[PDB]
Amino acid sequence: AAKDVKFGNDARVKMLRGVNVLADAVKVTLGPKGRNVVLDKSFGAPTITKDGVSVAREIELEDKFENMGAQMVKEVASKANDAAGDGTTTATVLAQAIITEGLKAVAAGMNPMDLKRGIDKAVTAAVEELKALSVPCSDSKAIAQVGTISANSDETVGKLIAEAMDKVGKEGVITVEDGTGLQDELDVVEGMQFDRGYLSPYFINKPETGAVELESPFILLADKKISNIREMLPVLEAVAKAGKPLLIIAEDVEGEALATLVVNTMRGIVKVAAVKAPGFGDRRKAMLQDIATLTGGTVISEEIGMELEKATLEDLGQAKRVVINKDTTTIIDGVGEEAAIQGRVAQIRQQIEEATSDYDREKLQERVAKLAGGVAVIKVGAATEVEMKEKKARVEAALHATRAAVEEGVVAGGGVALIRVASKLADLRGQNEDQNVGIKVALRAMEAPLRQIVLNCGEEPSVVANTVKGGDGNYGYNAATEEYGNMIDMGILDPTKVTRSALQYAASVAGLMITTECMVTDL
Amino acid sequence: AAKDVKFGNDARVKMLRGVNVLADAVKVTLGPKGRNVVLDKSFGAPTITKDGVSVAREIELEDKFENMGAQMVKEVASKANDAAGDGTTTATVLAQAIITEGLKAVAAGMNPMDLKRGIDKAVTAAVEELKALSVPCSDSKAIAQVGTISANSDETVGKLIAEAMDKVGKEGVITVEDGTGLQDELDVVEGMQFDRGYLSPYFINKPETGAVELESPFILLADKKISNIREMLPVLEAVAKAGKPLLIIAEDVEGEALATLVVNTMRGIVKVAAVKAPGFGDRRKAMLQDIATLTGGTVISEEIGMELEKATLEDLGQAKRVVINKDTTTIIDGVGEEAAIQGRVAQIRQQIEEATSDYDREKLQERVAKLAGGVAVIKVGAATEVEMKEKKARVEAALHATRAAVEEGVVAGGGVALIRVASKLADLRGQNEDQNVGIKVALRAMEAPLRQIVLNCGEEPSVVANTVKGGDGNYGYNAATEEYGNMIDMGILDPTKVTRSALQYAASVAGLMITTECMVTDL
Amino acid sequence: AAKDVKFGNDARVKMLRGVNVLADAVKVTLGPKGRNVVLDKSFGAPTITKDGVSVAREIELEDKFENMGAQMVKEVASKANDAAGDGTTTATVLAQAIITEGLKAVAAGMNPMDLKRGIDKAVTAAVEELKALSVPCSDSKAIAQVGTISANSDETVGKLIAEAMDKVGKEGVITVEDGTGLQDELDVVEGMQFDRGYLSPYFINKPETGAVELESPFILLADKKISNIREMLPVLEAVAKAGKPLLIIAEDVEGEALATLVVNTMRGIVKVAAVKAPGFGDRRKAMLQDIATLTGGTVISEEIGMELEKATLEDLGQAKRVVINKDTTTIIDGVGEEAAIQGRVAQIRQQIEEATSDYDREKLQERVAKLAGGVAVIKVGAATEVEMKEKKARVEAALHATRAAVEEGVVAGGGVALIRVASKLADLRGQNEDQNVGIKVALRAMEAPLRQIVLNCGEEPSVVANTVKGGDGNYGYNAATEEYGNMIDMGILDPTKVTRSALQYAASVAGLMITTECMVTDL
Ligand SMILES: Nc1ncnc2c1ncn2[C@@H]1O[C@H](COP(=O)(O)OP(=O)(O)OP(=O)(O)O)[C@@H](O)[C@H]1O
Ligand SMILES: Nc1ncnc2c1ncn2[C@@H]1O[C@H](COP(=O)(O)OP(=O)(O)OP(=O)(O)O)[C@@H](O)[C@H]1O
Ligand SMILES: Nc1ncnc2c1ncn2[C@@H]1O[C@H](COP(=O)(O)OP(=O)(O)OP(=O)(O)O)[C@@H](O)[C@H]1O
Ligand SMILES: [Mg+2]
Ligand SMILES: [Mg+2]
Ligand SMILES: [Mg+2]
Structure with a gap:
């Protein structure tokens, strides 16, 4: 079953109360002045983390309708999180701001659909304007800063990510592991990389993202392609023998060899992934060798013409870790030691000198880049297991945000980017008055992030907001030092990607909420 | 399930109340004036032990939030216990002191993160300063005193540990067993200890410490390495035949022999551990013989060239106990009697006289030390089973603390070491006022241990504290006699290790607690 | 019942709670922004508060403690209200601000005595500063502006005050009477005023103002004392007869006679008021005659020997109306012919010239002035009765503020003056830090009331206050304009007296509140 059915205003006030409890609990957290949130555990000491996300997960309300409103807006943070891995709190305060004024407009008699259309239009133009302003990333210091800011004041994690990307760039893979010990640790273990992917999609491991991952696997370099x-x-x-995955790097991924791997790993004996030697044709053999030199068992090449059979137990190689993905096959670390690896690099480096023509030169440089590009491993600091698992999360998000920032650039942090965008949209209009109110609702909500950051500092939101709007460009408020200045020069940046995502998911859920004619729930 | 979410001050007062109930229950116990704690049992008479730890284990509170605070600080004692095996009560009063003033500062509006940073800085410098002051251990009387003090006024256990370490030093192993009868008992049974460890990690027995332990096992001395x-x-x-473990001491741990042991003990028949004859090369055979002479079946040597096959049932040896670990293989007691053992010592003792050169001399002395170094067994006193199990615990902790004291030295007990350290840090400062308050919070908490000891005596904390701070060096208050004096001269010492651990774990948990923005728990 | 005695730190909070509740309601109302409040009536439709003062009356707290606190703050308002006549609300806000901070200081544990002392010191300094700041206000325009403000806002009311004031002069009495309505009429009634009062307070008529207005009184004049x-x-x-009040004038009554008269009069009920004949000695007699001339009745003298008893009602003259106030008694529109009166005046005037002495001259001047001055009346528009009453009250308040305002001069309103004063005040320090804190608190309190207006405006008081502070001289915020302009130019002036009164009153009350060692209540 029997249902309770309402109609009219009574659903809106319920929803609003539910989003307010959730948003208010979450938004404090944001802003350096407030610190951590505690999350209760059934056993032992509570968890202390500064996660907006950590707070949101615990929010469930008694009133069934208020709980619905809370669970709905909770979708904002989760989607922003899945998409950008940062900015969930920002997304939550934007949503509350849009929902609050939007529902007020509805109560005032304005058309919900028009309000939503106006909000949508403002967000569409705002995003375009955000792209226009955003500017790209820079060297490891900037990367560290953005990372720190995206990790909420962990400058350590920020530096790590920046250094890791400085080593392998985007190209190498960057990974995160629990720390070997209780320190932030960043080390490049020899990522060699090449373009495959896996021969069979059913090689996908645990990793849901659509990849495979092996730890200390063995590496068969069939240089020749495997005959037998x-x-x-x-x-x-x-x-x-168990725990040792096998990675097959034969001249191409076979039929013969591949088919066997698919059948064997299908029966639980020797789990195994196969990828071609890189490129085609001639370069393929040369590249298949670069992998051999890197993973330490140097197989008598396909170039030589020697076979997998030529390849042996010596031929087999090993690395702490290998991933085979959308990108590539990437071997992280290798049995071949840096001596061997760096030496191999020198060889191919001369190869580039020798090559008669540009084509041969390009192809060679491609190999050195792949073999020397490396992989960067981020170990979250440890001791105790709780803090270690937490810092790991932050490093993961900070990395994700910084990666996005590097691709298309970051914008002024501290909520100033959205404020600049809002000011540029002051003349934006829609098809009618209600749509115009919706546009204004959205532009007003765009100031919420900066205002909450200031409020958490113990300062006055309107005064600081008023002053920031007074200047222009990267002029903003540094909440850490409580001084105004150039946000970029002070190193307070946000990846354009997280800002954009926070705004779009906030507007999206807000738009939905806005129109509720009738509500149905269990008695 | 549905959660209750709070925010703000209300989490702090709850936590504080919870840590106060736990700390107040525990801290009495400390100080000789108060004696024992009783712990209820479902059947029979209650347990009477003076364990801060015993009291902590029983503390659980009704209010869910207060209980969380109690369970959190309870982590302080447990970690200090795991790390130093003593000083859990001291660690608990330091934590309460830091948490109390720290939360007061937070309520006053001070920045939690800065408070924690200040506390951390003070502890970092305090530990350095603690190392500077600490001074090393001395002969069996001093060892007994420190042991007694670390066991809370069991001077008996103190003497035992001191005597045991006087026999085997650190080198021999020291072990603790339930008493054969109702007395403190300390006896050296012939530890011969040689450097291996186990051939297969899969030999680890009960002792979670990564060692394996056999009781009255049989000892095969394959002198030759085992062929067949x-x-x-x-x-x-x-x-x-069951209950008799087997210890294989062949020329090296084999393949052939080792592989068999791994397979057999794998099928539950004859559990078995294997280790090489000590050293390499020539000395190996000579050493493998020293073990034979000690465990009584003297195998015709590898030196001789006679084989395991030469070795027989006579060859097999036996000892009350053998442990194979990080340190070594250590044989405690041996079928060979003291007559044989001490005689073997005399032999090797002349060997050292004979040796042409220093090298041969060094190598020989190494063997006599290993074979004569011995093992010391501590039997906790008994009758009845309850008291016996209790005294055993005390001896274990006292031993652990005394061992630490011997390695890097002890510091003045009675809480004076931390008071001296605190006074040396009077000018320590941080990056801001809030950090300075945090530093002061930590220095103030450092007086808590001495103050609680005095309070338990029925004396005035401030007066005694004031007087101790008035003097310097090892000048302190002897709570047993209620007289001031030189703590070291009066034999009141604490292993620097337990003092350091108590302080670090207290500051660590205190730091965590300090910042709680929001709290989430089950409804 | 028995009393519940509690310390009492709690006691402070309860008081704080009570004050806030009352304060909050009061604060909001103040300012044009402030909202309507109602007073309930047992019967009939509820009255209209509207003003804060009445607002306080309604508020009662269920909690005894809270209620008690609530009452105390109210007293501040009442006291301010009576003396100031205005600024009741202003005082309230100030008091609350002071109290809250003071309480916090109490929480601080700073010796509350110092805080109170510091507050007082600041207040004293402020008062002195304020006076200097205030500039004398004389202006038809100025008066009107003041009147308008008091009315909140009536230009006309101010106009009436100014007009009445001009005609009467400061010396001249101003009375308000309902007119036909709604019209503002200022007419000067002929009559004499002498500095007397009613002999018995039990003569108080209908006007609740502590006066007695008689219509067509019969006037009896006795030179002789009234024995009984x-x-x-x-x-x-x-x-x-009939329905006509009796006015009695006699030169003096002896105490002995008076006591009898008072007792008898008190016991009985009669409608009469008696005033001494003005002046002493012969002049008094002469003055009495003047009254008689004005009345048109004839004086009866003891010297004449005619008894009051002998004199009939007919003998007594009649006055169109008489009012008696503590300060003075007045006769208006006497029956007696003008011509006779004028001649009398002329004779007196000559008399004034005649007296050689200044002393004689002064007396002569006094006599003539009283007769000459007459009274002037202001008529408020009449009807509806409810409205008229309301208007009348407003007029009185405006007049009072104006009257006080004129002499002292007025200070700019908006609480600008308070802010200005505070800045100067800040430099001044208390004897000790606690006192200093108190001083600061007082300064802080001053700032608040400006904020309250702003808050009611909904403008963020922080910005306004900051801006206001920045401006020097007469700088202020005009709520209505919501523009920044000169307060004086704007013509929003708050009377010096009103401002001064409120501040002092609030401070006094706060001090008492601040320190309660313990609070006792009935259980
Ligand atoms: N120390 C800081 N000082 C000033 N602004 C900061 C600081 N750290 C982060 N910010 C800003 O706060 C905003 C959001 O970042 P932050 O990670 O702190 O919260 P969030 O990502 O919204 O919440 P969460 O990380 O839990 O999802 C950004 O605009 C960022 O620039
Ligand atoms: N007889 C004693 N007189 C004076 N001080 C003592 C005595 N025995 C122990 N102490 C002091 O008290 C502390 C150790 O005693 P105790 O073992 O009771 O405390 P604890 O180790 O913190 O409690 P627990 O052993 O249950 O963890 C040391 O600082 C030590 O110097
Ligand atoms: N337009 C305005 N701009 C600034 N301040 C104003 C304005 N109008 C009124 N005020 C201020 O409001 C106060 C006068 O109004 P009101 O009489 O209601 O206050 P109050 O006297 O404290 O309340 P009450 O008269 O009910 O006790 C003064 O401080 C005056 O300066
Ligand atoms: Mg974030
Ligand atoms: Mg102990
Ligand atoms: Mg007023």
Whole structure:
């Protein structure tokens, strides 16, 4: 079953109360003045983390309707999180701001659909304007700053991510592991990379994103392409011993060899992934060798013409970790030591000198970049297990945001980017008055992030907001030092991606909420 | 399930109330004036032990939030206990002191993160300063005193540990067993200890510490390295009979022999651990013989060239106990009697006289030390089973603390060490006022231990504290006699390790607690 | 019942709670922004507060403690209200601000005595500063502006005050009467005023103002003292008929006679007022005659020897209306012919010239002035009765503020003056830090009331206050304009007296409140 059915105003006030409890609990957290949130555990000491997300997860309300409103806006943070991995609190205060004024306009008699249309138009133009303002990332200091800011005042994690990207760039892979010990740790273990992916999609491991991941797997470099089972038999058994995945790098991923890997890993013996030697044709053999030199068992090449059978147990190689994905196959670390690896680099480096023509030169440089590009490993600091798991989360998000920032650039942080955008849209209008109110609702909500940051500092939102709007460009308020200045020069940046996402998801859920004619729920 | 979410001050007062109930219950206990704590049992008479730890284990509160605060600070004692095995009560009063003033500062409007930073800085410098003051251990009387003090006024256990370490030093192993009877008992049974560890990690027994432990096991001294199963067959079967572990001491741990042991003990027949004859090369055979002479079945040596096959049932040896660990393989007691053992010592003692050169001399002395170093066994006194199990705990902790004291030295007890350290940090400052308050919070909490000890005596904390701070060095208050004096001269010492641990774990948990923006718990 | 005695730190909070509740309601109302409030009536439709003063009356707190606190603050308002006549609300806000901070200081544990002392010191300094700041206000325009403000706002009311004031002069009495309505009429009634009062407070008529207005009173004049009521009575009876109050003038009554008269008079009820004949000695007699001339009645003298009893009602003259106030008694529109009166005046005037002495001259001047001055009346528009009453009250308040305002001069309103004063004040320091704190608190309090207006405006008081502070001289915020302009030019002036009164009153009350060692209540 029997349902309770309402109609009219009574659903709106319920929803609003529910989003207010959630948003108010979450938004404090934001702003450096407030620090942490505690999350209760059934056993032991509570968790202390500054996660807006951590707070949101705990919010559930008694009143069934208020709870619905809270769970709905909670979708804002989660989507912003999934999409950008940062800015969930920002997204939550934008949503509350849009929902609050939007529902007030509805109560005033304004058309919900028009209000939503206006909000949507403002957001569409705002995003375009955000792209126009955003400017790209810079060297490791800037990367560290953005990372720190995106991790909420962990400058350590910020530096790590910046250094990791400085090593491998975007190209190498960057990964995050629990720390070996209780320190932030950043080290490049020799990522060699090449363009495959996996021969069979059913090689996908645990990793849901659409990749595979092996830890300390063995690496068969079939240089020749693998003719026989016979050739594989020795390596397949070495991999049969458990915990050692096997990575097959044969001239191409086979039929013959591939088919076997699919069948064997299908029966739980020797889990195994296969990828071609890189490129085609001739360069393929040369590249398949670069992998051998890197993973330490240098297989007598395809270039040589020697076979997988030529390849042996010595041929087999090993690395702490290998991932095979959308990007590539990437070998992180290798049995071949830096001596061997860096030496291999020098070789190919001369190859580029030798090459008669530009084409051969380009192809060679491609190989050195792949083999020397490296992989960067981020170990979240540790001791105790709780803090270690927490810092790991921050490093993950900070990395995600910084990666986005590097691609298309970051914008002034501290909520100033959205304020500049809002001011540029002062003349934006819609098809009618109600649509115009919706536009204004959205532009007003765009000041909310800066205002909440200031409020958390213990300062006056309207005064600071008024002053920031007074200047222009990157002029903003540094909440850490409580001084005005150039946000970029002070290193307070936000990846354009997280700002854009926060705004779009906030407007999206807000738009939905706005129109509720009738509500139905269990008695 | 549905959650209750708070925010603001209300979490802090709850936590504080919870830590106060726990700390107040625990801290009495500390100080000789108060004696024991009783712990209720579901059946029979209650347990009487003076364990701060015993009291903490029983503390659980009705109010869910207060209980969280109690369970959190309870982590302080447990970690200090795991790390130093003593000073849990001291750690608990330091934590309460830091948490109390820290939360007051927060309520006053001070920045939690800065407060924590200040506390951390003070602790970092305090620990350095603690190392500067600490001074190393001395002969068995001093060892006994420190042990007694670390066991809370069991001077008996103190003497035992001191005597045990006087026999084997650190080098021998010291162990603790339930008493054979109702007395403190300390006896050296012939530890011969040589450097291995176990051939297979899969030999680890009960002792979670990564060692393996056998009681009255049989000792096969394969002097030659074991060629055949055949040679093992006789001893393996003798060990097949249950309760008799087998320890394989062959020229090195084998392949052949080792592989068999791994397989057999894998099938539950004859559990078995293997270790090399000590050293390499020539000395290996000579050392493998020292073990034979000690465990009584003197195997015809590898030095001789005779084999495991040479080795027989006579060859097999036996000892009350053997441990194979990080340190070594250590044989405690041996079938070879003291007559044989001490005689063997005399032999090797002349060997050292004979040796042409220093190298041969050094190598020989190494063997005598290993074979004569011995093992010391501490039997907690008994009758009844309850008291016996209790005294055993005290001896274990006292031993642990005294061992630490011997390594890097002890500091003045009675809480004076921390008071001296605090006075040396009077000019320590941080980046801002809030950080300075945090530093002061920590220095103030450093007086808490001495103050609680005095309070438990029925004396006035401020007066005694004031007087101790008035003097300097090892000048302190002897709570047993209620007289001031030189703490070291009066034999009131604390291992620097337990003092350091108590302070670090207290500051660590206190720092966490301090910042709670929001709290989430089940409805 | 028995009393519940509690300390009492709690006691402080309860008081704080009570004050806030009352304060909050009061604060909001103040200013044009402030909103309507109603007073309930047992019967009939509820009255209209509207003003804060009445607002306080309604508020009662259920909690005894809270209620008690609430009452105390109210007292501040009442006291300010009576003396100031205005600024009741202003005082309230100030008091609350002071109290809250003071309480917090109490929480601080700063010795509250110092805080109170510091506050007082600041107040004293402020008062002195304020006076200097204030500039004398004389202006038809100025008066009107003041009047308008008091009315909140009536230009006309101010106009009436100015007009009445001009005609009367400061010396001249101003009375307000309902007119036909709605019209503002200023007419000067002829009559004499002498500095006397009613003999018995029990003569108070209908005007609640502590006065007695008689319509067509019969006026009896005695030179002789009135021995007893009995003599009076026969006069009274004649006088009373019909429905006509009796006014009695006699030169003086001896205490002995007076006591009898008072007792008898008090016991009985009669409608009469008696005033001494003006002046002493012969002049008094002469003055009495003047009154008689004005009345048109004839004086009866003891010297004449005619008894009051002998004198009939007819003998007594009649006055169109008489009012008696503590300060003075007035006779208006006497029956007696102008010509006779004028001649009398002329004779007196000559008399003034005649007297050689200044002393004589002064007396002569006094006599003439009283007769000459007459009274002037202001008529408020009449009807509806409810409205008229309301208007009348407003007029009085405006007049009072104006009257006080004129002499001292007025200070710019908007609380600008308070802010200005505070800045100067800040430099001044208390004897000790606690006192200093108190001083600061007082200064802080001053700032608040400006904020309250702003808050009611809805403008962020912070910005306004900051801006206001920045401006020097007469700088202020005009709520209505919501523009910044000169307060004086704007013509929003708050009377010096009103401002001064409120501040002092609030401070006084706060001090008492601040320190309560313990609070006792009935259980
Ligand atoms: N220390 C800081 N000082 C000033 N502004 C900061 C600081 N740290 C972050 N910000 C700003 O706050 C906004 C959001 O970042 P932040 O990670 O702190 O919260 P969030 O991402 O919204 O919440 P969460 O990380 O839990 O999802 C950005 O505009 C960022 O520039
Ligand atoms: N007889 C004693 N007289 C004076 N001080 C003592 C005595 N025994 C112990 N102490 C002091 O008290 C502390 C250790 O005693 P105790 O073992 O009771 O405390 P604890 O180790 O904190 O409690 P627990 O052993 O249950 O963890 C040290 O600082 C030590 O110097
Ligand atoms: N337009 C205005 N701009 C600035 N301040 C104003 C304005 N109008 C009124 N005020 C201020 O409001 C106060 C006068 O109004 P009101 O009489 O209601 O206050 P009050 O006397 O404290 O309240 P009450 O008369 O009910 O006790 C003064 O401080 C006056 O300066
Ligand atoms: Mg973030
Ligand atoms: Mg102890
Ligand atoms: Mg007023």
